Design a binder for these strands. Structure first.
Length: 94
RNA sequence: AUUAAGACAUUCGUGAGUGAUUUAUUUCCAUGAAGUGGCGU
């Protein structure tokens, strides 16, 4: 397999700084670095150094020398562009 | 007066004709617009 497709459900409203665009959704520049660390941690059974050695062994690293990055491409897109906008404050008001 | 005297190795003649500094090469790789509440006990 070359492509992985997943459908995400939202439980809490994300605080997004680029809400102006109608296609504003979860940013992959945030997901990918955390997912890379999560997978390397899981590959090494809770240790990121063993997990990097595992990824280094099976040629899964973009660079074998200095980064945790894994060689995959991540894209997050909206299917239906209808969204709910929330005002989140720490003060009650009518 | 003597196998002697006279006689430009010279005339004409394009280093010229054909020819792509071109072919191959991702300005790309890594990166959280995030962190924290405080006081009125």
């Amino acid at each position: 397999m070359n492509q992985l497709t997943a459908i995400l459900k939202q439980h809490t409203p994300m605080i997004h700084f680029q809400h102006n665009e109608s296609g504003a959704t979860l940013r992959a520049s945030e997901v990918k670095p955390l997912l890379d660390k999560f997978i390397l941690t899981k590959l090494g059974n809770g240790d990121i150094r063993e997990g990097r050695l595992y990824a280094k062994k099976n040629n899964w690293l973009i660079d074998n020398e200095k980064n945790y990055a894994l060689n995959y491409k991540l894209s997050i897109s909206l299917q239906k562009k209808s969204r709910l906008e929330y005002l989140i404050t720490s003060s009650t008001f009518p």
